[PDB]
């Protein structure tokens, strides 16, 4: 916790640059893509469905 | 890509300008407590 | 010694002022900090020289 005027006003700087500076395409951000869909946690998750929905089926 | 942008935080505000400007008090170079004393030496010198 | 009399006869004596003034303001930030006084004799020496 512990936010203040400034830590709050650098973070909405900081949110609107990384958008912005993302439609010029200045941006490479494919270190946080590469968290979310590219990992095995997009196939490894659907290979525990595959089971729990079998499981669910007796 | 001039701009490289990590999962973590301080290096994604490095990239950008606000780099420093999280920090809740600006660096100094007189709060020292040895550089007081230099200077309180001249000082008492002069 | 033998300095000045190299630098006076090949001529560019600012090429020795200007290297001993730099030896002595480094010399005396040596010496403010580890704050010492009574400057050493090495500074004395350059102070003579230049």
Same mark, same amino acid.
Do not use: F, G, V, Y
């Given at each position: 916790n512990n936010v203040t005027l400034k830590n709050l006003t650098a973070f909405q700087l900081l949110s609107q640059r990384e958008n912005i500076c993302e439609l010029l395409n200045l941006v =490479?951000?494919? =270190?946080?893509?590469?968290?979310?869909?590219?990992?095995?946690?997009?196939?490894?998750? $659907?290979? =525990?469905?595959?089971?729990? $929905?079998?499981? $669910?089926?007796? | 890509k001039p701009i490289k942008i990590s999962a973590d935080f301080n290096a994604k505000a490095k990239s950008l300008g606000l780099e420093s400007k999280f920090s809740n008090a600006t660096k100094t170079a007189l709060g020292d407590p040895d550089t007081e004393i230099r200077i309180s030496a001249r000082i008492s010198n002069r | 010694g033998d300095d000045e009399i190299e630098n006076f006869r090949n001529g560019t004596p600012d090429k020795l002022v200007s290297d001993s003034l730099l030896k002595l303001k480094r010399l005396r930030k040596e010496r403010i900090l580890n704050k010492v006084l009574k400057p050493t004799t090495e500074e004395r020496e350059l102070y003579f020289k230049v």
């Open positions: =490479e951000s494919t =270190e946080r893509h590469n968290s979310i869909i590219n990992p095995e946690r997009q196939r490894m998750s $659907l290979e =525990e469905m595959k089971k729990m $929905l079998d499981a $669910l089926k007796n | - | -």
